[PDB]
Symmetry: D2
């Protein structure tokens, strides 16, 4: 009994007696992701190089996501990392949902062919007045659904909702996402730390001490392994499946961290918590932060509960 | 003028006036690569979860290459990371070439969907004696062709020969590798350092010093960025295209480093040198090491010349 | 504003306030069709011929259709051309729907690579007693939905329901059926007659006279063109889109015609009528015949209303 | 032993000791074919209906072949059914071969999704004079290679040369044509007749008599089955693999038949003869007709020897 994402979404829709609007939203998202996936794998690239004689992924992915979501008649406010201001869906195509997304995460890894993906956060419009940019300023805790598509060796879509986290593998032969890991839970403690040690000179005392323990454990256990793909979707997904910890904290030349709150942090923090993990800035929990700006940045620490807890305790140490 | 990998090798073969054996071998290598990519991308995976009522990638990739290479009738001896002993092709199928290959590099990244690939080195038989492992124990400097296939966001095959390095992007729609980067040359100096710092406790003084210098630059320049995918093929490719340095030096468990010389170090060292870069163990040149064990290991530091020489100088400073 | 079949099905489902059971049924059908389509195009055939060293489409298609439909939890009785008796779905997976289908039409065209397809008829269980083979013995007039997938130069899925007929093209790059012809209507009169003139010696007086008119028009107009692919799905689809007439009447050595009533005739008769066409046996209308046997055969004449009417009048001529 | 079309032509080239020019030409033909197939199958069609916010197959197929053949550097003159005049390749790209091709055969079947294909004939230049149309006006008997690509339920490329006929099935997953039928030989006698009977009023006495004999067999055998896809490539392929006869004789509009000699009749006549079959105008052998017009038409009857000779005898009986 094989489960396609389409069938899974539909069943979650009926079990919740939804009017069918969100179900359509998720089906469109899934369709947009397959269209980005094919573009990422370079299908039809030969024609680009004039195979029959006589654009950028970031822009194409964004266009695909915008149009597909508008055509779902399920959204009223869209927030993209590629648009300075929130997109207000045309009245005739409005739904009750607000979507925040990262059309193509890992830009610096684009040209070297390293893994990249798509991240999204789905919110229910919490008011009655006209759709505006503020409708997307809800804290992650309010998320109805969040997830991501990872374009690695294989394309995978991870979806998280109140019920839990599920991983679906894309079978490109039939354009179908197959459920291959149901109700996933991150392990209590991992053995991998992921962070750009390049900004070592700018790390606060906590991170600096935490890193040190990983390489030189006081209790003399085995040192953690290091892994940094350079793309949030990839590092995070490896975290969810192998366990461990992922980090992108602030630093002298980037006080509020680099990663954006609405379409990168919240989405991943939500997937992590629903998988039995933690996601913190170092002091407060990502999902509880009250967004003040659509493109606001936020420090983020996530992964296995024990590894994250160990770090939270070091922060208190330097409280 | 669109140029496919097929046309490219066929043309080189003619310029060189080869009898066609090496050309058929590179063509077979090309076919094997497309077959692995399709598998890695999970095509047909739906039949796995019985979409119609009802073999790991490592063994499959290995079996594909073996079968495809034997069937080329251009090889006599084969060395695989998956076989304890060298493989001697049956007489009826013997050619003059010796191939050393890493069917699926990046085993630890297989399940988390991170980039993986295939590495290969080709040598001509150097004796009239009956084929045996000896024929595979030549120094990298004798390679006639080397390269790899990266199965990342998209699939790319990098090929190097006496003339230079060329990158071919795979257009999966038509099953052709399109030439997208001619006679590639690495930047003299990069700004990215790649290594697993989890072995900090086991690094020697030079490596330690180099890494610190990358984080706290003496001339107070901006520190280098850190990147470590975990798959040699992925980190090495980013090094070739973006510039910088890649390192896997000796440690406790691996006093002579981890990576294998015949099918990992040499192929990447040949590619790196043909692109104007360097590849060293820290003491000598990778391509000049005469192996004595087909599964011999060797330390390796490679990438932009200026970055490598700087580390090389650290080594001789301590000596 | 592009419409995928998935979105179309969902919207037709909400507009009709359906519980969502039929919607799932149609999504599964659509998924099964893409899985048959990939198998028909021979994807992965290289592995069959041992590409990595060391079944029939009719059977595979049937398995795919059976399993996918059972997993929809939307059917109670299935009727396949490949099974002597109706399939009674397991109690735990029962839905209210009855499906009759031709998993792979055009068997004789299979080995010569000519177009083949899948035909289906969806019925609502019209009683209360236990699901039995009789639940599938309803006359086509009772059809809730009917259509077919044509695996020609390109794969297309034609779907007909009370509302009308729509054609969706399959974009294999993203495994998505795209609406390309909405509310299709066959033209009043065509200029192509399709029939196997091989059984000329066995045709009744009506057909014999009708054929003659096509070649030698009494009014001296231009003779009709002849076309006979040899596969019902192909000939019929060309009929729906180009107009004209398709015929498979009885004959001395096949008194009740060849084509089967439940999964070939009814489905196509329904698609035709909803497209403004006609489908007759020569006397009565296909959709009104009361099925007596699950694999009962029936003569069929279909296509443009004028061309079919012309033939019905010749029958009355020899009444 | 899996054999791809690439390996096959490369091997033949070696056995023949060619300089590699014809091999690169057949390799280019192979690439062009895969590019057309992908297009015919409608891959990427979603971008047409603006799935991301926003050229007929005949012109595209034509442009692909032209560009791909010119870029092979193996041709000097090209004849296409889509160009009024022969094409003379620029000096810098000139080879010794002359190619006559039918980029997309079966134009009337394009929109109804029925099987279509590409037909090609290859000749070596027969003079030292400057390239011109003359070089393309040689009798079929001079072909060095001919064949076609059928885009039916699956894509297949049939290739014929002095040695014989071989069929290669395209595995779209890896973009390779796999040898699935070696040294093909047509049945001495078939049981299928293919022709458009709509021109009955215009057929000559022999054709008329033959067709009647096929329906009412004198020896009272079972009548032949009728089949006419409407695309020469499709009907001819079924004739080669199942046996039987294919016909397109003269009529009012086309007194010298319809099908073109250079890129339709000859290629199929060469293939049919190399497979032990016959191809005649009814009076002489197709391959021996010396053309005088690149777009010259010719009557053609081809298929199983016994079936063709029987019709040939009808012709001489009347004469
Ligand atoms: N496909 C679905 N999967 C999960 N929850 C759903 C689904 N459809 C509806 N829901 C739940 O029902 C609420 C209302 O759905 P809707 O009427 O479609 O906007 C959503 O906010 C979800 O909490
Ligand atoms: N396709 C090719 N590309 C580059 N060099 C080639 C090629 N084919 C042959 N050669 C060179 O010619 C030598 C002999 O080729 P072969 O006669 O095919 O064994 C090889 O060892 C290479 O040095
Ligand atoms: N997706 C749909 N498209 C068209 N009609 C539908 C759809 N879903 C439901 N219906 C109609 O509603 C009836 C009951 O639907 P259901 O409750 O899903 O079995 C069906 O028999 C159809 O007449
Ligand atoms: N791949 C091949 N398959 C069959 N015959 C070939 C092949 N390559 C060359 N030949 C034969 O050798 C002749 C000269 O080839 P070339 O030197 O490549 O122009 C051709 O005209 C054919 O007769
Ligand atoms: O080079 P840096 O600063 O480590 O950037 C890495 C981060 O940047 C991003 O590309 C920005 O979204 C993330 O995907 C990734 O985690
Ligand atoms: O986990 P570690 O010790 O960093 O080793 C990773 C290395 O091992 C390999 O997977 C091969 O063993 C390489 O691809 C990669 O560079
Ligand atoms: O060879 P015949 O008798 O014309 O059979 C043709 C018919 O047979 C079938 O293959 C049987 O389903 C139909 O698809 C097609 O219309
Ligand atoms: O419609 P008609 O007159 O039977 O012609 C069909 C023939 O024409 C072609 O389409 C080429 O003109 C052939 O492929 C086919 O055999
Ligand atoms: Zn991002
Ligand atoms: Zn982004
Ligand atoms: Zn390796
Ligand atoms: Zn390996
Ligand atoms: Zn059938
Ligand atoms: Zn059937
Ligand atoms: Zn044609
Ligand atoms: Zn044509």
């Amino acid at each position: 009994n094989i489960v396609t994402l389409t069938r899974f979404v539909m069943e979650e829709g009926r079990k919740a007696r939804g009017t069918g609007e969100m179900t359509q939203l998720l089906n469109s998202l899934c369709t947009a992701v397959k269209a980005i996936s094919t573009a990422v794998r370079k299908a039809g690239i030969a024609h680009l190089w004039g195979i029959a004689g006589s654009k950028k992924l970031d822009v194409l992915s964004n266009d695909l996501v915008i149009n597909v979501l508008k055509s779902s008649f399920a959204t009223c406010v869209l927030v993209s990392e590629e648009d300075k201001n929130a997109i207000i869906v045309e009245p005739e195509k409005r739904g009750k949902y607000v979507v925040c997304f990262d059309p193509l995460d890992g830009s610096s890894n684009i040209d070297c062919l390293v893994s990249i993906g798509t991240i999204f956060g789905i919110y229910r419009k919490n008011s009655t007045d006209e759709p505006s940019e503020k409708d997307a300023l809800q804290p992650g805790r309010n998320l109805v659904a969040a997830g991501y598509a990872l374009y690695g060796s294989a394309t995978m879509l991870v979806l998280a909702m109140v019920n839990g986290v599920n991983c679906f593998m894309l079978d490109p032969a039939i354009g179908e996402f197959i459920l291959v890991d149901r109700d996933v839970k991150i392990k209590k403690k991992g053995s991998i730390y992921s962070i750009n040690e390049g900004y070592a000179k700018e790390f606060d005392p906590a991170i600096t001490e935490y890193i040190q323990r990983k390489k030189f454990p006081p209790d003399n256990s085995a040192p953690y392994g290091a892994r940094y793909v350079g793309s949030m979707v990839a590092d995070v997904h490896r975290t969810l499946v192998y366990g461990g910890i992922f980090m992108y904290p602030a630093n002298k030349k980037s006080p509020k961290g680099k990663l954006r709150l609405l379409y990168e942090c919240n989405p991943m923090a939500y997937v992590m918590e629903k998988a039995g993990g933690l996601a913190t800035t170092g002091k407060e929990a990502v999902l509880d932060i009250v967004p003040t700006d659509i493109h606001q940045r936020a420090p983020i620490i996530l992964g296995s509960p024990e590894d994250v807890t160990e770090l939270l305790e070091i922060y208190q140490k330097h409280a």
